[PDB]
A paper describes a structure:
We test the novel aMD/MSM protocol by both characterising and rationally modifying the free energy surface of human cyclophilin A (CypA). Our aMD/MSM procedure reveals a range of conformational sub-states of CypA where both the 100s and 70s loops exchange between open and closed states ([Fig fig1]).
To manipulate the energy surface, we implemented a design strategy based on hydrogen bonding patterns to stabilise specifically sparsely populated conformers with millisecond lifetimes ([Fig fig2]). This procedure led us to a previously unidentified mutation D66A. The resulting ensemble predicted that the population of the previous ground state was substantially reduced (from ca. 40% to ca. 15%, [Fig fig3]), and the intermediate (teal) state was increased in a compensatory fashion to become the new ground state (from ca. 5% to ca. 40%). Overall with respect to CypA the population of states in which the 70s-loop is closed/open transitioned from ca. 70:30% to 25:75%. Initially, we examined binding of an inhibitor against both WT and D66A. The *K*_d_ for D66A was 12-fold weaker than for WT ([Fig fig4]), indicating a substantial change in the underlying protein conformations. Using a combination of R_1ρ_ and CPMG NMR experiments, with X-ray crystallography we tested these predictions ([Fig fig4],[Fig fig5]) and verified that exactly as predicted, the 70s loop is substantially disordered and open in D66A, and adopts a conformation very similar to the minor conformations populated in WT ensemble. This correlation strongly supports the *in silico* design strategy demonstrating that the ground state of D66A is similar to the ‘excited’ minor conformational state adopted by the WT, and that the design process effectively swapped the major and minor conformers.
Numbering used by the authors: 1 to 68, 74 to 165
Write the structure that this text describes.
């Protein structure tokens, strides 16, 4: 089977910035890819639509996925599936966590190589189209992650 592709339409204080799409590496991390895919379509009855990027650190990453801390599709938190894929550069999609085996819905998009996270955060996808949109988002962050405008996922879903 072809790896899934999903998309986010990004808005800044309600004004459209464009569409970002992601390849999900289901061939290496099937359970982790399936969680993000289903949260993007809304098929379990909840997910990423309407949520914000709450933590943005320029030169590092954009983090989102906490909706009313977030939750996985497998009921609160699931195990680290593997560490096959590494944090190799801009556009890498990886799971946020609060220690071992604490994956939920929160995720981050890298804007640099973040090798110090290897073996602790599960990498599961990469930006395919719209990397410049992620770079534009990054400009609304700060040292501590606070955003100066409301950066939201206005819409989301599956393309393949
Ligand atoms: C670049 C990645 O940096 C972090 O992951 C920092 N930790 C973090 O935000 N922890 C909060 C959190 C709570 C519950 C779940 N499920 C996931 C995350």
């Amino acid at each position: 089977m072809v790896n899934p592709t999903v998309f986010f339409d990004i808005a800044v204080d309600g004004e459209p910035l464009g569409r970002v799409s992601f390849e999900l590496f289901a061939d290496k991390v099937p359970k982790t890819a399936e969680n993000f895919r289903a949260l993007s379509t809304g098929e379990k009855g909840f997910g990423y639509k309407g949520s914000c990027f709450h933590r943005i650190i320029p030169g590092f990453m954009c983090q989102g996925g906490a909706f009313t801390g977030g939750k996985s599709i497998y009921g609160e938190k699931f195990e680290d599936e593997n560490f096959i894929l590494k944090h190799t550069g801009p556009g890498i999609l990886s799971m946020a966590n609060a220690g071992p085996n604490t994956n939920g819905s929160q995720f981050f998009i890298c804007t640099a190589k973040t090798e110090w996270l290897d073996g602790k955060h599960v990498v599961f996808g990469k930006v395919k189209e719209g990397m410049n949109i992620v770079e534009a988002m990054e400009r609304f962050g700060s040292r501590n992650g606070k955003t100066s405008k409301k950066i939201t996922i206005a819409d989301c879903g599956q393309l393949e």
